[PDB]
Amino acid sequence: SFVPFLEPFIPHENTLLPELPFVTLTYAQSLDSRIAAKKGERTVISHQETKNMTQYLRSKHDAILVGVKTVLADDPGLNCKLGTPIRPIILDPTFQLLSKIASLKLIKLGLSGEGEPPVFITRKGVVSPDLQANLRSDYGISIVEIADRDVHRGKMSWFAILKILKDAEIHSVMVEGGATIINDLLICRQNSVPLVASLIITVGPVYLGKDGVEVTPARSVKLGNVRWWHGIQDAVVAASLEL
């Protein structure tokens, strides 16, 4: 199955950037490299054989990270079906989700103990210190702020985010999407060294077409240590990013 297949790619000590958590970038794509169907169309890409794999990967990571738009589009739970704890991290620069906090599935799971209470990553001063105290008391939420010095062209530095997480004793983070985060992380380097340690992609045998949500990085990206797995319907490629 996928367990021996993934054994070299689950978080491990041989990190080229030890001030950062072990970063897994992982997503499910159609053949034409879409990760969501067009607006109004149901998204069916990954089948249960590879959904199980994703749950297994979540059991090996301290944290799971997605962007606001993923939260808005999917209302994900962001816990682990095996029952191991995993900390949800939401990249929400202006805290758009504030008005939905009481409705979110990830908030509910944090309150029911079926999940861990989330961390939202925002720009400086987006959430006032007393709003943070109320949200922390009412929902268990933490707010983590990125200084303006670490924001370039309106994008928070991935290095700054990961260093904060690592300093909060998050030793491994599973970044699951969406397309913006995937595209940025695929090309993000620190002195030629990729921040992503493991890249694990489910390929579903479907086309979602030109109006689906596309993944493609701004330049070409070479992979190393490639290994393929497949089941009845889906295939999975695991790899590292080349220098």
Q: Are 54 and 26 in contact (CB under 8 A)?
A: yes
Q: CB of residue 206 vs ligand NAP: minimum separation in angstroms?
A: 11
The interface region with a copy of itself, picked from 6-14, 80-88, 92-100, 198-206 by CB under 8 A, is 198-206
Q: Are 217 and 241 in contact (CB under 8 A)?
A: no
Q: CB of residue 173 vs a copy of itself: minimum separation in angstroms?
A: 21
Per-residue tokens: 227: 């290994």
Q: CB of residue 63 vs a copy of itself: minimum separation in angstroms?
A: 25
Site string for ligand NAP, 51-90 (x = CB under 6 A): ---------------xxxxx--xx----------------
Please give the biggest Cα pair distance in the chain. 52
Per-residue tokens: 243: 């220098």
Strand spans (E) along 68-196: 87-91, 119-123, 142-146, 151-152, 155-156, 172-177, 189-190, 193-194
- β-pairing, 34-36 vs 155-156, is unpaired
Q: CB of residue 215 vs a copy of itself: minimum separation in angstroms?
A: 6
**Residue 142 pairs with which residues in a beta bridge?**
119
Q: Which residues bind a copy of itself (CB under 8 A)?
A: 29, 31-34, 37-38, 41, 186, 201, 203, 205-212, 214-223, 226, 228-235, 237, 239
Q: Which residues bind ligand NAP (CB under 6 A)?
A: 27-28, 35-36, 45, 66-70, 73-74, 91, 93-94, 96, 155-156, 176-181, 184, 213
